[PDB]
Design a protein around this nucleic acid. Structure first.
Lengths: 106, 82, 366, 97, 96, 95, 95
DNA sequence: ATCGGATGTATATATCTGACACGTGCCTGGAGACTAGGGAGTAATCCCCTTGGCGGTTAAAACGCGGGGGACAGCGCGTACGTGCGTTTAAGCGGTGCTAGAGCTGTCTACGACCAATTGAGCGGCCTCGGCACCGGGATTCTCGA
DNA sequence: TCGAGAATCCCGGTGCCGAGGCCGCTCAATTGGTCGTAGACAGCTCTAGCACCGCTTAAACGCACGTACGCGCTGTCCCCCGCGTTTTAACCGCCAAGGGGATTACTCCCTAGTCTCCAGGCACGTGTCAGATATATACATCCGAT
């Protein structure tokens, strides 16, 4: 019988518990730790992937290229606070031009 | 309580002396307010982590060792308290 | 509608405020100040009604009469007095050998008040002749017992301090039904209190096994003398283990609300599904005293440490309510135009559920 | 004494201070300030004399560092005066915008 | 030569994406980057919680310590949302 | 065409939209080979590995440039200068 | 009243070995305790994570070698690794 | 450029006091002996792939010129600040009482590791079909000098 | 305020390899007990952060002012760049190989764990002097005079 459906989450819980048990983070763990971790990873993954899909439909492309993920992570501010010193392969950079460097004439 | 006073508790000569220990001479008169601001925004995070740490330990007093623990969590380490 | 989703500030007409309760649909607030006075605030109108100089020692509980003419107060100095809502003076004065926990008025019998003395059986004091009738209990007579009416007050339910719950009649006192709570796995458990609703005859029970349970006031007289415990949902908090102090029922009959002590975690569920739906974000530092929703409209209002915090549904009607034939909406479709372009002599004279907790008759415009 | 030229006594003040080892902000105002700011996160907390002491030094440390950085960028500005925009420049370039 | 079996967080995040937007495809590179991200955050939180548990002379890892860790690590109202969601998940799991 | 400074904006925007690498494969690979031979001889590189290093470089490098940029703005000029690069490297806290 | 652990006697003897004329105050004791602890957790954690990298269940001396070479700066790392190798050899030769 | 005068700068002389360094006790860890059992290395292997190399070219680099736009030096200026002094004021020791809280200890009960086997979640192989790359050309928008 | 030329966007129009989905074949995740135990509750002890006040003065307050320089403006001149050219090896796609990285199997030996006793390092007194504290002084420096 399964264990992920007991809480209705999607990320595995048995896998998390086994990997944390063999990860020697401590010697003895409770029962709510694996389900709680599965839940928080679920929430963070959903938070990122919703913006990923929004960026995918921005350019009208079904497949999500990593550029979309880069834009979605960078344009948000809380992510930029949490993903401070992290880069992305093939990610690129969001467009930006300094304000005072903008020529004009009549 | 929340009081607008005691924020100016660092009166001008204290910042003067701190600037001197930094090694500057000519400081404009409009530096004091943003110094207060940056000091407050810095102190916010450390005091918040300290109170969370002391709360998790089920006691309502804060020591110094948990303070240096929070400081090391941010990245700035203190030596001389254990 | 649904659970409250907005946040309201505080309602502090005076600095101190200990207890609060709604009358029938949240009309007036019964503040028992910690100075020996009884203050009445106005709800849904944000005002005050009357201040009563009761006595010296402050009080700790409040309730109003079925006819709304009395202000009963479970005093901390054993002053079982019937303060008048109208004049503010004392109508009936009496003294009890034990203080009172839970004061209530039967919506069908205001003569017999609800008293919960400690280390002694509950006593109904009749306001017509100042006579005290002891509620017959079972086994011990020195336990921390709490007595409470049903929806209609027709049966009275008492909870003891060893694991025994008693069922008897509010007026005939025919103790013919008992109940034994489950003994966990090895050790027994006492009962802290019970709390009822206004529809469905359900009631929560708060015990010493750190777990809040729920029963219905229909399976004890049906089973007979004593049967096997069988709750619907053994709700509890399994991440912090917060103890439970005060918790009431919903203003609709389908929700369940539970209150913390210092953690500012106000939990809510529904009777249909025991799954958490929302949690309250309270600012830490104060102890919760009383909780009781609007008995009709979904809202939460918790008193704590002399102040009150309300999480509500603040509403203002949309700008598009100028006239039924006038709307202020946005659309990008072409307008759909219209497609369909007596004499009598009679004067005009015409001008949860409802119970009998009305007729406060207390309102002073000046 | 006599009306000295600006910055002249500043140099000897620097020399007296930069070699010194002491606390520059007073004690009572700072402990009162931290007790005031602690209220928002949680009320009715008790501090330890050893604790709060520690704190100020760390803060001073950080604050001192800031001036250092600002001074250098001030020299990069072809001026001796310190201006607010340089503080924001240092804060942003350090990595904690 | 000898084929090997490897574990990646590939199926679960794909199911999440379908549950959210059942109309958009994903790339293998995005799959690997999401796998790396989830491994990263998992290790970060677990290690911080473990060293906190050692800090408190506790030989166990309860569920409370993890929520303390996510209060410290996660900034802003995202922390409140995540901790509320975790409490919801555990409460819905226990009585089953 | 003419009007210098106009073509720069078009080029910079065009490249800002694009997200490809900027260093030819073979020269960078040979340079990594040389700097590895400096440490130890006869090291076999994974074609995936080299690529890896490659990307990280630009990341680091581009960040540096941006910082120097704002530093030039602090000096009432548009052109960036070597001195600003040492400014950024020292002020970052990585000397 | 109770039993508490510290590094007081050992650092004192090390001081007396090299400068048998200079005293220290309690603040020096506390700061040296903090320094030696801090470096101990840093190097020990690095060694643990190295051991976990290569799916190995043990931490031996050569793991400490790799950790010290990786973490400390160059010349001090060379001195430290030389002295440690000398110590381990003289320990193993005379067990 | 050169010299005299007020003034903070670092130095030597009593001394005294509380923190520094030393001698005692003994109990809790660590070193001495022994075991078994599970990690590990060491022989062997064989197919994946990384190094090496070759033909074609063109996209990219390399080099020269014309000039205009921006870096750089200077000059006035008037204005914001550092210096100086008389005055009030809250910091800084000083010393007092205690309750509120931290901290240590006996306890005993709900809770996590061991383990056996299952058996379905889950990982790998093969088409495959369409999302997307490649391409050819017309419609669409920007810019600067007459 | 208005053209010529010059770029980019988009509408087809077409061809191709990557995400996908099904089939087959495993291996570790539950379930249920089972067993030992780590921490939770209640009590008692002690000790110090806090409320409180007294008196003293180092320092903050704020005015006065005389000038150092931040800044706006000018002129200057010099070199970065864009446009054009010629020039060439990065890149593409194709070959072939050997070697070594990852896998299998195995015997052997390092170590967790237990038991064992004894010894050394922290709590605790206790004597004593290193440097702060206040006094008088030669000296180097900012300022002012020529």
């Amino acid at each position: 019988k399964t264990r992920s459906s007991r809480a209705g989450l999607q990320f595995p819980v048995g896998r998390v518990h086994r990997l944390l048990r063999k990860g020697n983070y401590a010697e003895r763990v409770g029962a709510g730790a694996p389900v709680y971790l599965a839940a928080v990873l679920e929430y963070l993954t959903a938070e990122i992937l919703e913006l990923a899909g929004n960026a995918a439909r921005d350019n009208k492309k079904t497949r999500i290229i990593p550029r979309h993920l880069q834009l979605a992570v960078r344009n948000d501010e809380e992510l930029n606070k949490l993903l401070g010193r992290v880069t992305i392969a093939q990610g690129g950079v969001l467009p930006n031009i300094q304000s005072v460097l903008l020529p004009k004439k009549t | 309580k929340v009081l607008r006073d005691n924020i100016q508790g660092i009166t001008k000569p204290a910042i003067r002396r701190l600037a001197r220990r930094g090694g500057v001479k000519r400081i404009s008169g409009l530096i004091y307010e943003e110094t207060r601001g940056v000091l407050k925004v810095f102190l916010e995070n450390v005091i918040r982590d300290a109170v969370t740490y002391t709360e998790h330990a089920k006691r309502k007093t804060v020591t110094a060792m948990d303070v240096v623990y929070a400081l090391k969590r941010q990245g700035r380490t203190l030596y001389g308290f254990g | 509608q649904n659970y409250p989703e907005e946040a309201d500030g505080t309602l502090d007409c005076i600095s101190m405020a200990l207890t609060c309760t709604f009358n029938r649909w949240g009309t007036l607030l019964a503040v028992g100040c910690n100075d020996g006075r009884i203050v009445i605030w106005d709800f849904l109108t944000r005002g005050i009604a009357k201040i009563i100089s009761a006595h010296i020692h402050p009080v700790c509980s409040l309730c109003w009469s079925r006819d709304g003419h009395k202000l009963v107060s479970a005093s901390t100095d054993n002053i079982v007095s019937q303060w008048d809502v109208l004049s503010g003076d004392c109508d009936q004065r009496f003294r009890f050998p034990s203080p009172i926990l839970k004061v209530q008025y039967h919506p069908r019998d205001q003569n017999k008040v609800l008293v919960c003395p400690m280390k002694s059986a509950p006593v109904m004091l009749t306001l017509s002749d100042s006579k005290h009738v002891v509620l017959p209990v079972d086994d011990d007579s020195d336990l921390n017992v709490v007595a409470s009416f049903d929806r209609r007050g027709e049966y009275i339910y008492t909870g003891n301090a060893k694991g025994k719950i008693l069922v008897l009649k509010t007026d005939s006192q025919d103790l013919v039904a008992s109940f034994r709570v489950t003994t966990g796995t090895s050790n027994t458990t006492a009962i802290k209190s019970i709390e009822f609703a206004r529809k469905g005859s359900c009631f929560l029970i708060n015990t010493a096994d750190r777990i809040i349970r729920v029963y219905d006031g229909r399976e004890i007289l049906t089973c007979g003398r004593d049967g096997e415990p069988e709750p619907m949902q053994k709700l509890q908090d399994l991440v912090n283990r917060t103890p439970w102090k005060k918790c009431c029922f919903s203003g609709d009959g389908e929700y369940i609300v539970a209150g913390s002590a210092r953690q500012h975690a106000l939990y809510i569920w529904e009777k249909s599904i025991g799954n958490l739906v929302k949690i309250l974000h309270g600012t830490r530092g104060e102890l919760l005293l009383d909780v009781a929703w609007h008995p009709v409209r979904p809202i939460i209002a918790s008193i704590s440490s002399g102040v009150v915090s309300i999480w509500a549904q603040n509403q203002v009607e949309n700008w598009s309510a100028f006239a039924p034939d006038f709307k202020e909406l946005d659309e990008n479709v072409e307008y759909e135009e219209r497609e369909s372009e007596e004499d009598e002599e009679v004067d005009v004279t015409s001008v949860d559920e409802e119970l009998e907790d009305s007729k406060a008759l207390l309102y002073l415009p000046i | 004494p006599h009306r000295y030229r600006p910055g002249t006594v500043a140099l000897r003040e620097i020399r007296r201070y930069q070699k010194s080892t002491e606390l520059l902000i007073r004690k009572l105002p700072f402990q009162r300030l931290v007790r005031e700011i602690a209220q928002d996160f949680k009320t009715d907390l008790r501090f330890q004399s050893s604790a709060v002491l520690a704190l100020q030094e760390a803060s001073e440390a950080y604050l001192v560092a800031l001036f250092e950085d600002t001074n250098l960028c001030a020299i990069h500005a072809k001026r001796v005066t310190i201006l607010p925009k340089d503080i924001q420049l240092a804060r942003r370039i350090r990595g904690e915008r | 030569r000898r084929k090997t079996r490897k574990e990646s967080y590939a199926i679960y995040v794909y199911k999440v994406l379908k549950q959210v937007h059942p109309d958009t495809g994903i790339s293998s590179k995005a799959m690997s980057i999401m796998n790396s991200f989830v491994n990263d955050v998992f290790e970060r939180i677990a290690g911080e919680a473990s060293r906190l548990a050692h800090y408190n002379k506790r030989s166990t890892i309860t569920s409370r310590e993890i929520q303390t860790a996510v209060r410290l690590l996660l900034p802003g109202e995202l922390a409140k949302h995540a901790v509320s969601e975790g409490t919801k998940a555990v409460t819905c799991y226990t009585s089953a």
